[PDB]
Design a protein around this ligand. Structure first.
Ligand SMILES: Nc1ncnc2c1ncn2[C@@H]1O[C@H](COP(=O)(O)OP(=O)(O)O)[C@@H](O)[C@H]1O
Lengths: 619, 574
């Protein structure tokens, strides 16, 4: 599907026009090469005409007038032959002058050589300019990805933007790099050949160009015929992919219970069905070229027969007919895959307009380089009422206070708005009718990058990028050393299992080792956070997939022991955060109560409810 | 490399019944396409020279007959080639799936689910795409050259030598270009995959990337990746720009030398004028076909890398199999005779599991607890023979598990994995996997046992309610409850629980354990968990750390026997 052809096309062009002189020079070289390549057959036909003249002028008696020879031939009969002689230019009795033939063929070969050289240099220049502009466009895409706010990514499908920035750029490449050369040469060739063949003979031009409406009609009809089968093939391949999904993802559950045979039978049935569907659809799609080839060849037959008839009449020369027989073939050449270029160009148009809409969105609000840093680690919140969309006050009138060096923790039900709070601390989303301060200064007056370089943050889920475990750990501070890396590793207890992996600190994390489960991925992530030596650590469910004992040891190691920094701890298990310098109880925003372990349990709050109810098994 | 050709010559072998017909039809189509300008030229040679417009009109009738034969045989060739390519794709998909089903969990983790699926659904598609293109579009150029030389020989024994010497230099130039260009294309694909991986990793992070403020590093990494891709792009573009001009120049110089040599022989009377028209048409057909095929040829590196991946899948044979005559007790019960069990991946320093040993009587319930990374996760798979031990031995009913019938064992083992997964469909179908022929009341009783009858009854349409892939439509531990019901309908002699109870609350876990004791008292139960409350009531408990046992006994004895479990006790106490 497409929604803007002209606008996206002109934007794609204006992505290339900045070359200006280079672009116009490339266009000039291309058009000159096409024109001279069209001209070449004309001089070849002229040379063939000279040869044919010198051949059939031998049998006539020498010294006669051309009109006299025509009359002598016509008197004995040979009416068509007499017409041929009348319409053709021979002095009777004279042979071929090889000097003129040599001159003409030398001119032809020279112009062909310069045509090839110009075509090559034009191709090299177009490749250089398209690759340069393409690198610039991809760099702009990357820069925008660096500048975009988080709400843009969070408000769409997970694979949507990924396909828009990865696959659509490749489509842009495989579309424009092809078209701007081949389609441009095709259109220049068709214009040049049509004007030359119009200067040759008009009836021949009609007998040729009748194929264009026929070609477009037949390709449109074949496309409309194949579209239902193409959609069916798409649907059936989607069904096959989905079935492969649930038989591969739950492969252990398939090997257990012994259901390999049933899954194999279902797969075989749907695979055969998709085989038939793909067979039909692909046959109907691939039969486009033979049909237009036959239409062009029927046009060629008409050209040949009418050219023979007209040569017998004498209205035209043989060499012009030879040039025309060449020209009809070079005219047929583009139409064989003009539909292919059209569909590829339309796909590139759609991808280009999508990419441009991505590149024209709002960016971050030009963070002022205030460059504020923390000294003690005091935090403060003032009546923030943030919402993803107006009408859903997920955060509402919180006034939490934490002294520097405190390990204040928060408890609440899943989905109540914890991650929203930690994002607001990160300036991932702006504040709404609230004030937040670090060490007594508002963050909104502080540059975002300087803040984020000093916080230290881990999410509910882990993130890992292609590379070794050592690379993932060192991502926290690249200019550190392996001694520091292993020190942080021992601090985060990843060492207890990293040696169990095939090669410690060297396993490709994108290549799952099987033994690398979610909890130890969380350990890797928290180790990465540790290496950066943060002063405002926040633990947002970073220990969900790990045992409680490991959580208590690591917490006592790097938060309770590290009295020099304050910390936020978020966990769904109360015993994991018991005795952690006052605890907050938040229930879908609307922070309820605050206090230390004993004081908060003694006041019979919701914290007391959850501690009493869950441990006692009461429901 | 040559992996693509090996896979082809192995798997398209049953389709020589069809590809030969495709080739024959392509040959006859191109021979007709070259017979077309031959009689076109004959029109000038005879009809024009004699002036007989009749000869022209019947030669036009023959013209139409030839082109009709060409189109019908060409469309037949395309039809049969499409059939052959689709059959090849179907056979490749079936073979890949059948071979990969023999894998264990080890190989599945080695390859990865998403990578495996994309390999088996898109790489095979690319391979069949290339097969159809080469059997319907690419082979035109070689057949075109062969037909051109053959028809030049047919026309005369003279001027044909110039065509016979002009075509091979074209072919050599094409081969020279492609030999250099192909490695550039494979490096192109490698860099494209790398940059796509970089983009995917960056977008997946975003939050963490902005948090650590590693913008300076990410920017330069993307810049260097794109610059390397640009260098490869320029390298490929050089040869691509060389491609068309050399072919065009070769055809043009062949044509000019053609006219130059033909004129001399025609002057002597050895050659006729129409042969020039025929030869020019032959060379232009050659140019069109060669350009078209070489332009389509850019698909080759895609098929090369796809074949490399498919060979990666197919070459790795499974290391787990029945030993061609295992024992069939058919009445196995709970023994689990772990004895000095050891397990370790190759190249690792510390083993996954080592020198552990424990046994359970026929109907007792045991559990294992410990810190994450201790290797307890793989112990369940070792019991169920998803992984084979390195040097240890664990026996069921006195005979080591590797000597058992693995199908019978899986029949007698009820397992809930740590990755609670459900197949797309309905509960009344996913739950069938425990028995495949269960009854509705049995399913409802299982939901009662799994402490899950409440919400499944709450659904308006009944227990036969739809589920998405992986149970993602559910809230969480509901999936674990469904897995428990699936396991319990089977009535297995041995129960395997792998941290499934962690996703549940204390009271629901207690109810589930009480139901299991009520129903499966005769059978044995093995539980993996990180929660003490789920393990307290077990008959015996074993605690493992760093892949070895650190404590065995009961909860009452172990709470004071070893400080290692006292760590868990203090961590869970309030
Ligand atoms: N991208 C988003 N767009 C709209 N609403 C969202 C988005 N992300 C989260 N929410 C809503 O905001 C709430 C956030 O809760 P969350 O911070 O995840 O709590 P917790 O961290 O305890 O799980 C959720 O209930 C969800 O419905």
């Amino acid at each position: 599907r497409t929604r803007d052809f002209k606008g996206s096309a002109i934007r794609l062009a204006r992505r290339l026009l900045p070359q200006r002189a280079l672009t116009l020079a490339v266009i000039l070289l291309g058009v000159g090469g096409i024109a001279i390549g069209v001209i070449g057959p004309r001089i070849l036909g002229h040379a063939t005409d000279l040869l044919f003249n010198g051949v059939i002028g031998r049998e006539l008696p020498a010294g006669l007038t051309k009109e006299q020879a025509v009359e002598a031939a016509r008197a004995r009969g040979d009416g068509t032959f007499a017409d041929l002689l009348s319409g053709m230019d021979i002095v009777p009795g004279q042979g071929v002058d090889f000097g003129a033939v040599g001159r003409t063929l030398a001119l032809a070969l020279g112009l062909y050589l310069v045509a090839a050289l110009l075509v090559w240099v034009q191709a090299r220049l177009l490749n250089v300019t398209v690759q340069r502009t393409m690198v610039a466009l991809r760099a702009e895409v990357q820069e925008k990805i660096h500048r975009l706010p988080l709400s843009y990514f969070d408000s769409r499908q997970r694979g949507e933007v990924l396909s828009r920035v990865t696959n659509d750029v490749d489509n842009i490449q495989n579309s424009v790099s092809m078209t701007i050369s081949q389609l441009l040469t095709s259109v220049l060739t068709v214009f040049a050949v049509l004007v030359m063949m119009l200067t040759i003979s008009p009836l021949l031009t009609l007998f040729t160009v009748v194929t264009v409406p026929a070609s477009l009609w037949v390709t449109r009809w074949i496309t409309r015929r194949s579209q239902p089968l193409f959609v069916a093939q798409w649907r059936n391949t989607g069904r096959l992919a989905a079935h492969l999904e649930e038989t591969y993802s739950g492969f252990t559950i398939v090997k257990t219970f012994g259901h390999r045979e049933a899954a194999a039978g279902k797969f075989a049935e749907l695979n055969s069905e998709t085989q038939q569907s793909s067979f039909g659809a692909q046959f109907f799609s691939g039969l486009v070229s033979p049909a237009t080839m036959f239409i062009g060849n029927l046009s060629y037959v008409a050209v040949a027969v009418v050219g023979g008839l007209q040569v017998a009449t004498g209205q035209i020369t043989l060499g012009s007919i030879q040039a025309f027989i060449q020209y009809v073939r070079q005219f047929n050449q583009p139409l064989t895959q003009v539909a292919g270029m059209y569909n590829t160009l339309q796909s590139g148009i759609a991808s280009a307009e999508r990419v441009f809409d991505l590149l024209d969105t709002e960016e971050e609000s030009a963070d002022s380089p205030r460059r504020a840093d923390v000294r003690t680690g005091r935090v403060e919140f003032e009546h923030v009422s943030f919402s993803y969309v107006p009408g859903t006050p997920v955060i509402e009138d919180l006034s939490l206070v934490a002294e520097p060096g405190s390990t204040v923790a928060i408890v609440g039900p899943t989905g109540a708005g914890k991650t929203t709070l930690v994002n607001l601390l990160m300036r991932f989303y702006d504040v709404d009718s609230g004030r937040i301060t670090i060490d007594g200064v508002d963050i909104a007056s502080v540059s975002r990058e300087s803040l984020r370089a000093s916080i230290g943050m881990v999410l509910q889920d882990t993130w890992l990028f292609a590379g070794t475990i050592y690379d993932n750990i060192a991502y926290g501070r690249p200019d550190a050393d392996e001694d520091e890396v292993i020190e942080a590793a021992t601090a985060a207890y990843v060492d207890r299992f990293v040696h169990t992996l095939p090669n410690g600190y060297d396993t490709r994390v994108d290549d799952d080792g099987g033994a690398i489960s979610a909890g130890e991925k969380q350990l890797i992530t928290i180790a990465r956070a540790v290496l950066a030596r943060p002063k405002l650590l926040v633990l947002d469910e970073a220990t969900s997939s790990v045992d409680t004992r490991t959580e208590l040891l690591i917490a006592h190691a790097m938060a309770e022991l590290r009295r020099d920094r304050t910390s936020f701890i978020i966990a769904h298990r109360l015993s994991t955060i018991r005795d952690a310098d006052l605890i907050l109880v938040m229930d879908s925003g609307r922070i309820i109560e605050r206090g230390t372990h004993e004081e908060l349990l003694a006041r019979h709050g919701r914290y007391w409810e959850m501690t009493r109810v869950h441990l006692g098994g009461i429901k | 490399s040559n992996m693509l050709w090996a896979l082809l010559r192995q798997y398209v072998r049953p389709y020589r019944w069809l590809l030969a017909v495709v080739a024959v039809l392509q040959v006859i189509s191109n021979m007709a396409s070259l017979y077309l300008p031959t009689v076109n030229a004959a029109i000038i040679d005879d009809g024009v020279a004699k002036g007989d417009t009749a000869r022209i009109v019947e030669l036009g009738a023959v013209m139409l007959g030839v082109t009709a034969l060409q189109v019908v045989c060409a469309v037949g060739a395309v039809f049969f080639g499409a059939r052959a390519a689709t059959g090849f794709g179907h056979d490749l998909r079936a073979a890949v799936f059948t071979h990969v089903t023999t894998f264990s969990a080890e190989e599945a983790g080695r390859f990865g689910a998403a990578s495996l699926l994309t390999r088996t659904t898109n790489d095979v598609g690319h391979i069949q795409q290339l097969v159809q293109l080469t059997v319907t579009m690419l082979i035109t150029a070689p057949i075109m050259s062969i037909g051109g030389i053959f028809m030049a020989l047919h026309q005369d024994a003279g001027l044909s030598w110039l065509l016979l010497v002009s075509v091979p230099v074209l072919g050599l130039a094409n081969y020279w270009i492609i030999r250099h260009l192909m490695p550039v294309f494979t490096r192109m694909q490698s860099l494209i995959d790398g940059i796509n991986r970089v983009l995917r990793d960056q977008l997946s992070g975003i939050r963490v990337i902005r948090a650590f403020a590693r913008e300076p590093l990410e920017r330069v990494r993307f810049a260097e990746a794109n610059q390397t891709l640009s260098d490869s792009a320029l390298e490929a573009g050089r040869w691509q720009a060389l491609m068309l001009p050399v072919t065009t120049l070769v055809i043009n110089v062949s044509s000019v030398a053609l006219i130059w040599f033909g004129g001399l022989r025609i002057d002597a009377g050895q050659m006729q004028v129409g042969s020039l028209i025929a030869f020019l048409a032959y060379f232009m057909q050659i140019l069109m076909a060669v350009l078209m095929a070489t332009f389509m040829l850019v698909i080759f590196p895609r098929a090369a890398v796809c074949a490399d991946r498919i060979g990666e899948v197919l070459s790795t044979q499974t290391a787990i199999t029945n030993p061609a005559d295992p024992v069939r007790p058919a009445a196995i019960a709970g023994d689990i005779g772990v004895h000095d069990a050891t397990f370790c991946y190759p190249g690792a320093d510390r083993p996954v599991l080592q020198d552990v040993s424990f046994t359970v009587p026929r109907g007792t319930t045991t559990a294992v607890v410990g810190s994450t990374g201790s290797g307890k996760s793989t112990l369940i798979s070792l019991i169920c023979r998803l992984y084979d031990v390195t040097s240890g031995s664990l026996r069921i009913d006195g005979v080591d598990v590797r000597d058992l019938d693995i199908e019978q064992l899986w029949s007698a083992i009820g397992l809930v994995p740590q990755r609670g997964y459900l197949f797309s469909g309905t509960v009344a179908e996913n739950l069938r996997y425990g028995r495949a022929d269960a009854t509705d009341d049995e399913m409802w009783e299982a939901l009662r046992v799994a402490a899950a009858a409440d919400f499944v009854r709450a659904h308006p349409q009944g227990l036969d309610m739809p589920v998405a892939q992986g149970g993602i439509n559910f809230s969480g531990g509901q999936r674990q409850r469904l897995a428990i019901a699936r396991a319990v309908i089977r009535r297995p002699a041995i129960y395997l629980f792998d941290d499934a109870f962690s996703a549940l609350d204390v009271h629901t876990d207690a109810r589930v354990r009480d139901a299991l004791r009520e129903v499966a008292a005769d059978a044995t139960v093995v539980i993996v968990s990180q929660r003490i409350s789920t393990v307290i009531e077990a008959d015996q408990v074993v605690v493992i750390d760093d892949g070895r046992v650190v404590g065995i006994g009961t909860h009452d004895t172990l709470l004071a026997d070893c400080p290692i479990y006292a760590e868990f006790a203090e961590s869970q106490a309030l």
